């Protein structure tokens with residue numbers, strides 16, 4: 001009863017990329033200039049073990065099948081000696097951004113980021129897609145006013161039953177740690193941890209506690225603390241994302257509604273000191 005995935009996998013010529021510089025490691029900053037049409041597109045290029053190909057091709061499959069203003073768009077792959085070509089998000093991952101600009105993030109930007117992440121996550125749930133790695137590090141920043149979800153290296157297309165492997169323990173639900181079960185609601189848990197990272201301006205969840213004890217702590221009933229800038233209204237939303245009963249956690253469509261209400265009066269829900277004074281074509285316009 002599944003629908004045919006008629007997504008298009010675009011294959012680009014290497015002679016069309018101008019690897020400007022290295023963004024990290026390898027991921028490169030560059031330009032994609034399609035032959036003929038006078039257009040330069042700022043892109044990120046993710047550059048031979050047969051496992052690595054099989055996995056980056058799996059990620060290219062997922063990114064080619066999603067199309068949402070809050071999900072990272074795939075432009076294509078290059079079959080050299082395999083490269084992912086994605087939209088360049090010039091302000092980096094949201095985790096490093098809130099850490100850099102701690103003294104400039106207003107309650108407006110925080111609550112709006114929570115709305116946008118829930119929108120992209122709700123879209124992924126519409127596509128019957130479990131992310132399995134939602135975190136502040138995996139949310140990229142196009143502009144301070146526009147963020148998108150990235151990194152689908154663990155994404156799965158539908159509960160999902162994993163069989164093993166390295167996984168980020170402090171972001172995943174209890175059911176994911178004990179039974180390797182992943183659902184859209186286990187993504188809601190990771191959403192709760194991701195909101196906690198933003199409200200704490202990039203603090204590390206369970207900083208110091210070894211990952212092997214996380215399963216014990218959560219079973220005891222202990223959760224992440226209430227961030228200083230958070231009213232009980234916002235912290236209650238995170239707490240609901242951390243219920244043991246997965247179906248008691250809020251839906252992504254509900255998290256959109258809640259944070260949108262808060263985004264209409266941000267200073268009522270986030271208390272931040274000084275909150276008052278805080279031919280190039282982008283990929284989104286090349287269709």
Ligand SMILES: *CCC(=O)Nc1cc(Nc2nccc(-c3cn(CC(F)(F)F)c4ccccc34)n2)c(OC)cc1N(C)CCN(C)C
Pocket residue numbers: 023024025026027029044046086087088089090091092093094096097137140
């Ligand atoms: C989280 C860190 C970082 O974001 N650095 C960064 C990123 C970008 N833009 C950008 N656009 C699209 C894709 C990426 C990107 C994706 N990955 C993961 C993987 F698997 F490697 F593809 C990256 C890893 C490392 C770097 C970039 C990756 N990024 C950017 O645009 C100019 C700049 C930067 N920085 C160098 C800033 C460093 N941090 C944010 C302070």
